[model samples]
Target: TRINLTLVSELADQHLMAEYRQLPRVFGAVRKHVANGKRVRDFKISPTFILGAGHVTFFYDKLEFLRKRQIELIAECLKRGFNIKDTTVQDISDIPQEFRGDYIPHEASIAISQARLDEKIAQRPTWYKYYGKAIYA
Candidate 1:
């Protein structure tokens, strides 16, 4: 469940490294635990990995983990001076289209940034597709 260095190196080779590096580093801690094809039934991994891998199959299946990650993401973004309120980085659409029927924009914002969470959401992906989406999606 480690970060496929292959994927990491691939992103680097494509010159997407800069952008890739901008994602939440907290995901790094869970890279080793990330399954290759998404069989995550644990509440102990980063949702960011699923987003990075572009497959919702790897997402945290439990509500507690999802909510916790979402909160952490929101707080992290806000602490870094991001404006999640009107930011175009996160798309509410993906919430319904992907996981968690009750998911909010702030949950999406956990790994997204716009107007200085560190970079522009536009620089990454647009709408529901956040930085991780930009890289893997």
Candidate 2:
């Protein structure tokens, strides 16, 4: 199945351009990554475009072209009937050193960060309630 994904960090980079174009300079790469939102900036294109981090990652994961080849590797594992109930970074001992630290941390780092974000989203009591898209009262 085909999946769709709009790059948000890239879009946010567009909307917040004047404020972020000249930061510490290291973020210049990030700025370039999201300059395409000019095509759909106003509400004319989609009425509303709310970006979600999970959606971004999933859409990109499934729809990315060159990277799509990796899906076969996942399918191969499934075809072998391998169950991953107790898997961890350590369990996959053949990975190169550089990729080791990229594994999810055992600690609750992601959970804590997401909890804070959810708390703030809930606090946004009044939103634009764009056209007939989503109503937030």
The numbered model that scores best in TM-score is: 1
User: Residue 69 of model 2: what lDDT?
Assistant: 22
lDDT of 2 at 126: 54
Candidate 1 CA-lDDT value: 0.34
Candidate 1's C-alpha runs over 4 A off are 1-54, 86-137
- How far does residue 126 in candidate 1 sit from its true spot (Å)? 20
Best by lDDT: 1
Give the alpha carbon lDDT tens digit for every residue of 13-118 in model 1: 2223333233323233234334243234443445443434442333333323344444444444444454556222333232222233233435444344222322
**Residue 4 in candidate 2 has what lDDT?**
18
* Candidate 2 structure quality by residue, lDDT tens digits, 1-137: 11112221221211122212221121222223334332112212222222343322222211122123223323333333445331221122322222222222224544453444345435652532222222434
Superposed by TM-score, candidate 1 places the C-alpha of residue 117 at a distance from the truth, in angstroms, of 16
Q: How well does candidate 2 score on lDDT at residue 68?
A: 30
Q: What is the TM-score of each candidate against the true structure?
A: 0.26, 0.23
Ten residues in a row with the worst lDDT in model 1? 1-10
